[PDB]
């Protein structure tokens, strides 16, 4: 009655069928044998796996409510423990998601306000990139300081100074955690956390980075409590603390300190790491494909010029830039197995029985690379989202933010960030790799919870 899958052994589950260094490939290799919907055992953790566009959409959209429960990511749940928007369920999820979405809008997300903040911030990236004097540099922290400063703008009330040593520290913590969760040890941790959380190893270093990010948030919150004005909120934290006051006589309220610290931490991490990684992978992809970079320059110079900052409405007159970013996201596949979902109830799904609480892995990478939706799925080719005529061609398999009821509500900010950061860098600079185009490896360095591109250096040269 459960979907078919390979026979597990007691406790270790399907250990013998999985290579934890390549979870995505192992699962895809299993899906080739069993079909697109299968049951896998991550140790004693039973998970149903959805591969391909049709399986992912049929579950997450066509049966949206049923598949709207949140599952586990054990590394991250070490600190969160079900608190905060991302890892919450039921009433807690309803309440925090509604609040988060509305308070981000109040602070300019999808509005003129945040567009101005992003333009300013891009401005500061531009100056910082000129300041290398065309140097061969690691762009990791330049990109990530810039990106993080936007969400930090919204949640903490001010940006970080690029020279701030504590800022760099947090960014290393973030990079560190995503790194770990995409290593074989990270993925074994997903299978055997109840043992491994008590064992020395890279787990312990990852928990310590998570604890450092937690301590920094709770000290930012403590500061806000001590200085709050209930009639003029400075930031997201302020808004949340005001609601905590209004709610202190509701006995069943989800608005309390632990949910504030953990939601704020979801936002800070969310709004920092994915867009940053996307950009870094982006500049690698473009350096590997000079023909695509040249076509980008052409369009920016024609539609925008050189005399001003790019804006968000510029998107509508720029078919090719939209297709490069969509293709960057589709190739990049930054979060390849989504965040895990779970069935809210005993559930019937295309002739299988899913008991209440069964964890579900929507293989977003299998949709981004579904050969029914994309011609040569393993090639970076911006034409994947283009008319024969050259107009922007959408895709139902374009799913890097997932779909359904618990879909990324950061999509709006991220899309605005990607566009303005990519064009404003492209307008002001051309990209020059440390090796020739043919010797650049664009294959990932780590794939697990995230797709992590290889360490590289590059140069930014003015036009
Ligand atoms: C390149 C950019 C981004 C990518 C690829 C991405 C990807 C994802 C994915 C795959 C999920 C899981 C959704 C699901 O379970 O169906 C998610 C959820 C989430 N994301 Fe993002 N995201 C991005 C940007 C952002 C930004 C900028 C923020 C914060 C401003 C953010 C915050 C969140 C939050 C809070 C959730 C939890 C949704 C929920 O459980 O209700 N993300 N994102
Ligand atoms: C594993 C959950 C991570 C967290 O703490 O909150 C969001 C984050 C994952 C994520 C979702 N959207 C972008 N990111 C980087």
Curated annotation (Swiss-Prot):
Changing residue 341 to H: Increases phenacetin O-deethylation activity 2 fold. Its EC number is 1.14.14.-. Changing residue 172 to S: In allele CYP2A6*16. Changing residue 163 to E: In allele CYP2A6*15. PROSITE patterns: CYTOCHROME_P450. Changing residue 440 to T: In allele CYP2A6*7. Liver. It catalyses: 1,4-cineole + reduced [NADPH--hemoprotein reductase] + O2 = 2-exo-hydroxy-1,4-cineole + oxidized [NADPH--hemoprotein reductase] + H2O + H(+). Changing residue 129 to H: In allele CYP2A6*2; unable to catalyze 7-hydroxylation of coumarin; causes switching from coumarin 7-hydroxylation to 3-hydroxylation. Keywords: Endoplasmic reticulum, Heme, Iron, Lipid metabolism, Membrane, Metal-binding, Microsome, Monooxygenase, NADP, Oxidoreductase. Heme binds at residue 408. The keyword Metal-binding applies. GO terms for molecular function: arachidonate epoxygenase activity; coumarin 7-hydroxylase activity; enzyme binding; heme binding; iron ion binding; oxidoreductase activity, acting on paired donors, with incorporation or reduction of molecular oxygen, reduced flavin or flavoprotein as one donor, and incorporation of one atom of oxygen. Its cofactor is heme. Exhibits a high coumarin 7-hydroxylase activity. Can act in the hydroxylation of the anti-cancer drugs cyclophosphamide and ifosphamide. Competent in the metabolic activation of aflatoxin B1. Constitutes the major nicotine C-oxidase. Acts as a 1,4-cineole 2-exo-monooxygenase. Possesses low phenacetin O-deethylation activity. This is Cytochrome P450 2A6. It comes from Homo sapiens.
